[PDB]
PDB file of C-alpha atoms in Angstrom:
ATOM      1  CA  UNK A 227      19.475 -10.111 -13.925  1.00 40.62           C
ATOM      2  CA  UNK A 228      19.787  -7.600 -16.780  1.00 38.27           C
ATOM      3  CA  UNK A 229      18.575  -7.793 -20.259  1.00 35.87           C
ATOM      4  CA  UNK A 230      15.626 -10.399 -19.637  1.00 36.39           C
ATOM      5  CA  UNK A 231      13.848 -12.115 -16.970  1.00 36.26           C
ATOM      6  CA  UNK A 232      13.341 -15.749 -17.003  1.00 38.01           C
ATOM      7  CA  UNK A 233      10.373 -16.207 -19.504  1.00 35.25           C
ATOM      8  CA  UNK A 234       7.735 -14.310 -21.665  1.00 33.84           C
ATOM      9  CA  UNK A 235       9.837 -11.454 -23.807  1.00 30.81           C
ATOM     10  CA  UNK A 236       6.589  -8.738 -23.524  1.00 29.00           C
ATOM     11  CA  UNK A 237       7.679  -9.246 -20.091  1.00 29.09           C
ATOM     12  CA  UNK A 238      11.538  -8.995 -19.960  1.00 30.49           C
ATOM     13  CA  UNK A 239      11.230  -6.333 -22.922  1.00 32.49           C
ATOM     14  CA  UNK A 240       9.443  -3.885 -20.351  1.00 30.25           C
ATOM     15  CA  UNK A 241      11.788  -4.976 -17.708  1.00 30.78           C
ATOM     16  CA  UNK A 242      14.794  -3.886 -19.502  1.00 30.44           C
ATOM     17  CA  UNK A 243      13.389  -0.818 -20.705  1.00 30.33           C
ATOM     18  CA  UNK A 244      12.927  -2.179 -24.907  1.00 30.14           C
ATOM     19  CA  UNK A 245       9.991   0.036 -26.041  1.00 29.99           C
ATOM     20  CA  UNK A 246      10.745  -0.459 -29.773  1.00 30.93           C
ATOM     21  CA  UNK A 247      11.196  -4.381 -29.164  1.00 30.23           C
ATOM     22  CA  UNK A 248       7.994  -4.099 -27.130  1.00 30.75           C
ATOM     23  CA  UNK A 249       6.159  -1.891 -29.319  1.00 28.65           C
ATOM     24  CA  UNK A 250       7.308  -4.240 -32.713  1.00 30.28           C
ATOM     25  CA  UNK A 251       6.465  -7.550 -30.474  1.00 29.93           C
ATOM     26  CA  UNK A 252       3.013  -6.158 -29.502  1.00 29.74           C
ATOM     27  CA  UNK A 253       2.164  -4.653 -32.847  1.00 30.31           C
ATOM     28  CA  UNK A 254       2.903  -7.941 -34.960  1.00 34.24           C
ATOM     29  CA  UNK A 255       1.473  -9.889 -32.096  1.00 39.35           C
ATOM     30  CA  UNK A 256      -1.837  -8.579 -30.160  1.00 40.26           C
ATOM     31  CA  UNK A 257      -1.674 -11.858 -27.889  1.00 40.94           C
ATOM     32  CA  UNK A 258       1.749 -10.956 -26.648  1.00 39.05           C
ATOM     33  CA  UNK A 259       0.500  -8.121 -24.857  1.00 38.51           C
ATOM     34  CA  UNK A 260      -1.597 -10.016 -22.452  1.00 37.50           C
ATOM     35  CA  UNK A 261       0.419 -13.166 -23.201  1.00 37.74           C
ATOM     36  CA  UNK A 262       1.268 -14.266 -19.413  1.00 37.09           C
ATOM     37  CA  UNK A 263       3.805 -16.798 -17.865  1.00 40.67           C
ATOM     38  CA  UNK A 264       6.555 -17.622 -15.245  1.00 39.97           C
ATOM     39  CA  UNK A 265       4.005 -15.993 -12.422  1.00 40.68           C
ATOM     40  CA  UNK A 266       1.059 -14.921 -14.765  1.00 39.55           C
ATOM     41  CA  UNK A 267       2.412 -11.848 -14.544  1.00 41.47           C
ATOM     42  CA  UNK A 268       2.108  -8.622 -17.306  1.00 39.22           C
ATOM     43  CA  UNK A 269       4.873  -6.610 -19.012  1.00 38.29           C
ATOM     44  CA  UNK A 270       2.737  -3.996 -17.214  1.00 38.88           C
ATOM     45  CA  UNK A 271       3.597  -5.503 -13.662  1.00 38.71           C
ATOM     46  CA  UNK A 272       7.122  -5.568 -14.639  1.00 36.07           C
ATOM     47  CA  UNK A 273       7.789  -2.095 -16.402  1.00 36.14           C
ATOM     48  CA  UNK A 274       5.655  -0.497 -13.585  1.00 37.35           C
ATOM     49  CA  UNK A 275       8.042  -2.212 -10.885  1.00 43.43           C
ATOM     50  CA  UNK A 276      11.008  -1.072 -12.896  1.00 42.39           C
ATOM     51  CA  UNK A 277       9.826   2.603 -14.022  1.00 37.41           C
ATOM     52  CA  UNK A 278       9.748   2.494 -17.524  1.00 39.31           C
ATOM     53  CA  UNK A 279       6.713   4.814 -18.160  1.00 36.07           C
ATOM     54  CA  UNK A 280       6.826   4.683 -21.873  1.00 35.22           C
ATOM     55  CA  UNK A 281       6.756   1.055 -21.800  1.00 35.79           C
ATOM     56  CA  UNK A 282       3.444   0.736 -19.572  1.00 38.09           C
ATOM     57  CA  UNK A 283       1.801   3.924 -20.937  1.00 41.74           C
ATOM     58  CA  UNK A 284       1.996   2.501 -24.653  1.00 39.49           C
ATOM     59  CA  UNK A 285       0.729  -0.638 -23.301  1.00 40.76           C
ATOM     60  CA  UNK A 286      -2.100   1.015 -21.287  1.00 40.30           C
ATOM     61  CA  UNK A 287      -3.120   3.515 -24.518  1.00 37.18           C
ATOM     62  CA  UNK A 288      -3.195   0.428 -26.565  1.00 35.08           C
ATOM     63  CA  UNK A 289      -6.530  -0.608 -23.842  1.00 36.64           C
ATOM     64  CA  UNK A 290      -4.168  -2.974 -21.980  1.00 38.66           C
ATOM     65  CA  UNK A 291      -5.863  -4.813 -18.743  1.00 34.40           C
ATOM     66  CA  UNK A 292      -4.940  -2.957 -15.304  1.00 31.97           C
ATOM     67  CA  UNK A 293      -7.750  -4.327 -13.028  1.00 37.98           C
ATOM     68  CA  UNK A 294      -5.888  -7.402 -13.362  1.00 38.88           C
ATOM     69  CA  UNK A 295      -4.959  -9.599  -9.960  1.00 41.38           C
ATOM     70  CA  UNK A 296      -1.808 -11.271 -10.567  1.00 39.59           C
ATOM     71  CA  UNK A 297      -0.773 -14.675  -8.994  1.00 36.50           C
ATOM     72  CA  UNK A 298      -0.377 -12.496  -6.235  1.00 33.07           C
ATOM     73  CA  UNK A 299       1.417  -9.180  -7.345  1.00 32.15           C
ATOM     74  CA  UNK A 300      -0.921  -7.150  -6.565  1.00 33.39           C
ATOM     75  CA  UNK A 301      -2.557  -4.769  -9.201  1.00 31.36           C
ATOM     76  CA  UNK A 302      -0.375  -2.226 -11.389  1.00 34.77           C
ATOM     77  CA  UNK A 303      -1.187   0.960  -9.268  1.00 33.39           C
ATOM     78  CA  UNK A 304      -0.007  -1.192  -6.278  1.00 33.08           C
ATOM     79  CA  UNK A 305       3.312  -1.765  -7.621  1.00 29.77           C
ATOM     80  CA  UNK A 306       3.739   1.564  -8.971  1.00 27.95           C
ATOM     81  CA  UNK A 307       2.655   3.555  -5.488  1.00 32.06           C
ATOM     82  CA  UNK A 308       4.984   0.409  -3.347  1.00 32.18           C
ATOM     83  CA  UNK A 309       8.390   1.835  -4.567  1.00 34.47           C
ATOM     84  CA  UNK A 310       7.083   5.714  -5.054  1.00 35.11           C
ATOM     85  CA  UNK A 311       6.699   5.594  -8.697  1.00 33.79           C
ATOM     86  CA  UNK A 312       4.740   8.779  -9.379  1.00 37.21           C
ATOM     87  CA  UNK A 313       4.779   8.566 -12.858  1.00 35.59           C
ATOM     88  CA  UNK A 314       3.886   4.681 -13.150  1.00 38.04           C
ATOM     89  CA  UNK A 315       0.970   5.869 -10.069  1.00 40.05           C
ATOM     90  CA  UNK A 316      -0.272   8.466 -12.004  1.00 39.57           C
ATOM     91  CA  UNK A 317      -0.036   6.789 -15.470  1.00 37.88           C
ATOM     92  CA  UNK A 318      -2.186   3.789 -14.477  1.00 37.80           C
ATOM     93  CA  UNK A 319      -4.776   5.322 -12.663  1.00 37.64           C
ATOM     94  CA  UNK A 320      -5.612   7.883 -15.917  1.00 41.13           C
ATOM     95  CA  UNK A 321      -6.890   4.481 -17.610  1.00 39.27           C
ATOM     96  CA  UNK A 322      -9.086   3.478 -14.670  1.00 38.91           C
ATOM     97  CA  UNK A 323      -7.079   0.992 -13.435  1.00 43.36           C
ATOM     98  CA  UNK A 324      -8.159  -0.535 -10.045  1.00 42.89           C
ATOM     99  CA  UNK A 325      -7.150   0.572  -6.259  1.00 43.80           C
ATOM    100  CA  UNK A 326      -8.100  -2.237  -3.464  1.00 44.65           C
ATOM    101  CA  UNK A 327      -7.340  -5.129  -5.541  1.00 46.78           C
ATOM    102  CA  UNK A 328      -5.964  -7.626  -3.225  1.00 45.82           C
ATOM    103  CA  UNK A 329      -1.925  -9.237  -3.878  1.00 46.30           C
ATOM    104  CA  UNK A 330      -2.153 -12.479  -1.556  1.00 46.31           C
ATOM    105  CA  UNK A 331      -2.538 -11.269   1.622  1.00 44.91           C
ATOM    106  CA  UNK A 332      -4.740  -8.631   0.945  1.00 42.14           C
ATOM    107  CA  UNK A 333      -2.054  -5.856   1.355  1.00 44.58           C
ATOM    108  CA  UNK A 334      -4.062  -2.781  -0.432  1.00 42.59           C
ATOM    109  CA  UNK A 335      -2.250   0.010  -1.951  1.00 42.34           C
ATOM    110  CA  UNK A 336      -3.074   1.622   1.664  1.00 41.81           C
ATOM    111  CA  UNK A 337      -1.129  -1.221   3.059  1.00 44.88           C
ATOM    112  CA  UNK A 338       1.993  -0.744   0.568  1.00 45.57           C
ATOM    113  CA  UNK A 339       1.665   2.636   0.603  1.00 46.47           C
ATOM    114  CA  UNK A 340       1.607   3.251   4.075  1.00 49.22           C
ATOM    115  CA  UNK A 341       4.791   1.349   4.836  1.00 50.26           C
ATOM    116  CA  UNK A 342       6.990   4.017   2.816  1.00 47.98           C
ATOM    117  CA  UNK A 343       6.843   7.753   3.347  1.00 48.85           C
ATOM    118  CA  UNK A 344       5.174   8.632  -0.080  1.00 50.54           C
ATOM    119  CA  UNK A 345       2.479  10.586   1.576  1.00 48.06           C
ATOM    120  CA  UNK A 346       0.963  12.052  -1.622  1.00 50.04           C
ATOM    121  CA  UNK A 347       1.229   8.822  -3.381  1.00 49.40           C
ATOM    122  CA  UNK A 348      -0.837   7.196  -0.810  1.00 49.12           C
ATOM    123  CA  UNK A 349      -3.576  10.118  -1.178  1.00 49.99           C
ATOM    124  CA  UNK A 350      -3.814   9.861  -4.164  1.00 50.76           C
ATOM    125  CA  UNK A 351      -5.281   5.878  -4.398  1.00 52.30           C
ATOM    126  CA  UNK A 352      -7.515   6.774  -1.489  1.00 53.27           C
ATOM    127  CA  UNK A 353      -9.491   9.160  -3.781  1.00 50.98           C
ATOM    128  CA  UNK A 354      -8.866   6.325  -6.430  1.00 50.79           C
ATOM    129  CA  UNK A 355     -11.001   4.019  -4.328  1.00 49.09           C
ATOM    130  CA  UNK A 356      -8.607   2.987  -1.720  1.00 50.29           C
ATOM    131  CA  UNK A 357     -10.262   1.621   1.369  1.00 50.87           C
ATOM    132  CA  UNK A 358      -9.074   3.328   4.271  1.00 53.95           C
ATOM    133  CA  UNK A 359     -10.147   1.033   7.116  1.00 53.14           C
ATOM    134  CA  UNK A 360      -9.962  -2.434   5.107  1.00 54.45           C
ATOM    135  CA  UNK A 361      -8.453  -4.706   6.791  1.00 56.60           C
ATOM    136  CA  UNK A 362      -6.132  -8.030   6.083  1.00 57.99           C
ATOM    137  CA  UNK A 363      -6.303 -11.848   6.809  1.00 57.68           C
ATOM    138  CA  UNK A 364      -4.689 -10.681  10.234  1.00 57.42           C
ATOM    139  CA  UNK A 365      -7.144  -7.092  10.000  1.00 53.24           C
ATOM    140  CA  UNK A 366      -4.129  -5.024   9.709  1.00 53.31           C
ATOM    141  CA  UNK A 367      -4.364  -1.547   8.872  1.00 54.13           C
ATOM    142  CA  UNK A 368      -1.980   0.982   6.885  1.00 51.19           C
ATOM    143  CA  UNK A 369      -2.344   3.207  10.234  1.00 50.06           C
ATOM    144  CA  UNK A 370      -0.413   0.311  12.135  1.00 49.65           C
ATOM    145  CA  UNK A 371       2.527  -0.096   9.817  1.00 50.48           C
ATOM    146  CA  UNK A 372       2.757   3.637   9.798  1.00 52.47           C
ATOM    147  CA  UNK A 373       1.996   4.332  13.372  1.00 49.30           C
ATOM    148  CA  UNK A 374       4.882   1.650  14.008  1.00 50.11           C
ATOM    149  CA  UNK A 375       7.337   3.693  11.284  1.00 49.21           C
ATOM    150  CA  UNK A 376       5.843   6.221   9.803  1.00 46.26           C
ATOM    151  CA  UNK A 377       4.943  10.242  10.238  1.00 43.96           C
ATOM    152  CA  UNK A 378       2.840  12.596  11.172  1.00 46.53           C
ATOM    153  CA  UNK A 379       2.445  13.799   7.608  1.00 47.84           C
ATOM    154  CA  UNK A 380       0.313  10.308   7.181  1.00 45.67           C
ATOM    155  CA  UNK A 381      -1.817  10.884  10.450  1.00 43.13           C
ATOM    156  CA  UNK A 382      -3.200  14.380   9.204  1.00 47.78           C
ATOM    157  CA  UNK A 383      -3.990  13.050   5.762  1.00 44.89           C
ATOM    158  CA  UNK A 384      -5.078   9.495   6.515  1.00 43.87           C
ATOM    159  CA  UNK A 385      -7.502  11.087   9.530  1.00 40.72           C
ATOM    160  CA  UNK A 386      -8.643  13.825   6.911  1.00 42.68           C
ATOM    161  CA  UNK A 387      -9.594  11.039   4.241  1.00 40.09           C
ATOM    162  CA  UNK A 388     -11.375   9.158   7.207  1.00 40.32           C
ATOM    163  CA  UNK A 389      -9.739   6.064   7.966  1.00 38.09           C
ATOM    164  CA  UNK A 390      -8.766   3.642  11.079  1.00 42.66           C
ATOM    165  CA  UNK A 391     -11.437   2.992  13.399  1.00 44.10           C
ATOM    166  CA  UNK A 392      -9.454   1.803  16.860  1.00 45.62           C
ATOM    167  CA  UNK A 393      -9.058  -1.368  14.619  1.00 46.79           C
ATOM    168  CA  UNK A 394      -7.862  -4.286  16.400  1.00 43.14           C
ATOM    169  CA  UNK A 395      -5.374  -7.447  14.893  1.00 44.81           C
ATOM    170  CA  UNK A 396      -6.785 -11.369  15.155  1.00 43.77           C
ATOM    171  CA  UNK A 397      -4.764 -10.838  18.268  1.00 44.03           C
ATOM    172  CA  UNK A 398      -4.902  -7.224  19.209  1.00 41.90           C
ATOM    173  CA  UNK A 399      -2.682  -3.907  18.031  1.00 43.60           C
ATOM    174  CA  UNK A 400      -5.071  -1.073  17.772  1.00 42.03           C
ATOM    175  CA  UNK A 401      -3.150   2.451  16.555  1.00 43.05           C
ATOM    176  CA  UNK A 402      -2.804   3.221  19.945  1.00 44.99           C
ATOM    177  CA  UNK A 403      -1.045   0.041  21.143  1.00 48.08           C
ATOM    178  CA  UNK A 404       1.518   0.187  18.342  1.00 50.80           C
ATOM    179  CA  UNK A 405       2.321   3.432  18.741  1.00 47.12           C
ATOM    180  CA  UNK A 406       2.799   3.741  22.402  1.00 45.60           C
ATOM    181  CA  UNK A 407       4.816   0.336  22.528  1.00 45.21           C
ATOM    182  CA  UNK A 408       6.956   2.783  19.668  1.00 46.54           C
ATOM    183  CA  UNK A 409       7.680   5.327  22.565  1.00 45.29           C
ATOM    184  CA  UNK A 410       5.704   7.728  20.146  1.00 46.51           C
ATOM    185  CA  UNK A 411       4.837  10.479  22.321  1.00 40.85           C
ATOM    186  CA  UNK A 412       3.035  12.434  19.165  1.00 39.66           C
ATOM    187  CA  UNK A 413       1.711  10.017  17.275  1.00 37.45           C
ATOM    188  CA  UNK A 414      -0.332   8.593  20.632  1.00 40.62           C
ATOM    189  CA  UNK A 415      -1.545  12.127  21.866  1.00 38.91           C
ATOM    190  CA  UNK A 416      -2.861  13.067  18.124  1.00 39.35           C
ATOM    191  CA  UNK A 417      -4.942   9.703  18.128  1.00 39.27           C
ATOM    192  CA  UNK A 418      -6.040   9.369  21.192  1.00 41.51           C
ATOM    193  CA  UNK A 419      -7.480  12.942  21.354  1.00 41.38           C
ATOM    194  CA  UNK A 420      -8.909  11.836  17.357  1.00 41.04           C
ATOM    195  CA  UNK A 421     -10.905   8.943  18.660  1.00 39.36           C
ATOM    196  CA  UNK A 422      -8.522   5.959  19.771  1.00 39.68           C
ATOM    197  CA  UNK A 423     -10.294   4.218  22.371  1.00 36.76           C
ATOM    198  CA  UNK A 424      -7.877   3.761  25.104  1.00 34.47           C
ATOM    199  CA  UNK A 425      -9.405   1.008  27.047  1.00 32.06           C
ATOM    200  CA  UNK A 426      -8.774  -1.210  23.921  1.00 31.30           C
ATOM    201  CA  UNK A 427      -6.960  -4.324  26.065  1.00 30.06           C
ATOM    202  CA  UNK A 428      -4.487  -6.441  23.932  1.00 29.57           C
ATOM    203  CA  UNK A 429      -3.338 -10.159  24.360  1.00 28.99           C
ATOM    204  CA  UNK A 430      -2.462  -9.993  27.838  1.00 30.76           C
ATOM    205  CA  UNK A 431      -6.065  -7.852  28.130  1.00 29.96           C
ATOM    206  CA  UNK A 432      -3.924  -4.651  28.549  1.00 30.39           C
ATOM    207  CA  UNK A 433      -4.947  -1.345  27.427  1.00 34.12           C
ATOM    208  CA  UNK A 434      -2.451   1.159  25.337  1.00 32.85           C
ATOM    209  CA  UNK A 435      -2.407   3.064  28.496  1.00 30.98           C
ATOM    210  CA  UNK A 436      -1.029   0.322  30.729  1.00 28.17           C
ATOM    211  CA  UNK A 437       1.221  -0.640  27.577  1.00 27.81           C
ATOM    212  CA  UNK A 438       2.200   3.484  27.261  1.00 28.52           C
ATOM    213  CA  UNK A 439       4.632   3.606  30.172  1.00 26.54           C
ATOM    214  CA  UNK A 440       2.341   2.652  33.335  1.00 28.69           C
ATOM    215  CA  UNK A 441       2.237   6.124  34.247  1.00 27.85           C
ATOM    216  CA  UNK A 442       2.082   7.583  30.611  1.00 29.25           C
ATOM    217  CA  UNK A 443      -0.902   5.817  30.008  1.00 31.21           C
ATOM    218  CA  UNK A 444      -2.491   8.128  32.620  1.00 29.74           C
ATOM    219  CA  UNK A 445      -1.934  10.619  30.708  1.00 30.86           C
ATOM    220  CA  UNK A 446      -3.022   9.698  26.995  1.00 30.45           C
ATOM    221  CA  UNK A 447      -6.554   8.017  29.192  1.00 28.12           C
ATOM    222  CA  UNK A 448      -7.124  10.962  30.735  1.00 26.62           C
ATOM    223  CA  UNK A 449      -7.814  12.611  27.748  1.00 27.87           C
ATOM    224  CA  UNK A 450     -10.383  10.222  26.912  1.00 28.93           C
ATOM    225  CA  UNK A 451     -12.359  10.051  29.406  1.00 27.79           C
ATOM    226  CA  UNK A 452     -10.538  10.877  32.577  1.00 24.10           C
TER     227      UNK A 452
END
């Protein structure tokens, strides 16, 4: 658990925080700071999901790779924004580092980002190059996970960047269907009056409305188009 990993010391050297180990390793060997193992994985991808700034901002200055996919950790940014890192977010995107790199299952920074409450993390990688509709092997969205447990925070940034489009899972769950099955009075009314299509039917080919509360679908259809 503590001290090192399992393999690669660049890697367990970030992970427990060693700058001067990491520094001396890298600066007598240029290899070990791209040197990968265990999971292909970077000292970068472990210092950022630790914290250690120092460690992955004297890797980065050195010119570092960032845009790098991992066997499916995600990018560096994406780890760093995950666990609210603002210092690790902040630190890799200064050297350019990417923003919708895809993990495995495609879960952007939006994605990651979206299922914690770090609303001005998540703004942040939007700007970056975050896509705000993209969608996952099931077409997912960040508005979903958020709409499902989330805030209202998210909705007024997420709708000022420009992002969900009524989008609908391989099986259906729109913003709208999520949100109302969440007994989310709010979160419902704000979307629906945005642009939240309520005629969307799901799996059983029924519409947020009819999934609202029978009656409180009246309501939040009305407002489209009633």
């Amino acid at each position: 658990m503590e001290g090192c990993v399992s393999n690669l010391m660049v890697c367990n050297l970030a992970y427990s925080g060693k700058l001067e180990e990491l520094k001396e390793s890298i600066l007598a060997d240029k290899s070990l700071a791209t040197r990968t193992d265990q999971d292909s994985r970077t000292a970068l991808h472990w210092a950022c999901s630790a914290g250690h700034t120092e460690i992955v901002e004297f890797l980065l200055q050195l010119g570092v790779p960032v845009n790098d996919k991992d066997d499916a950790g995600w990018s560096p940014l994406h780890i760093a924004a995950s666990a609210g890192r603002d210092e690790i977010v902040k630190a890799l995107l200064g050297k350019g580092a990417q923003v919708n790199a895809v993990n495995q299952n495609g879960c952007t920074p939006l994605h990651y980002a979206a299922s914690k409450n770090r609303h001005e993390i998540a703004v942040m990688l939007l700007e970056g190059g975050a896509n705000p509709d993209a969608k996952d092997h099931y077409e997912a969205t960040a508005m979903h996970r958020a709409a499902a447990k989330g805030n209202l925070k998210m909705i007024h940034i997420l709708l000022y960047y420009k992002a969900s489009t009524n989008i609908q899972d391989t099986e259906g769950n729109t913003p709208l269907h999520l949100a109302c099955d969440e007994e989310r009075v709010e979160e419902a009314k704000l979307l629906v009056s945005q642009g939240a299509s309520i005629y969307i039917e799901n799996k059983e080919e029924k519409t947020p409305l009819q999934v609202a509360k029978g009656g409180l679908g009246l309501i939040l259809k009305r407002m489209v188009e009633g």
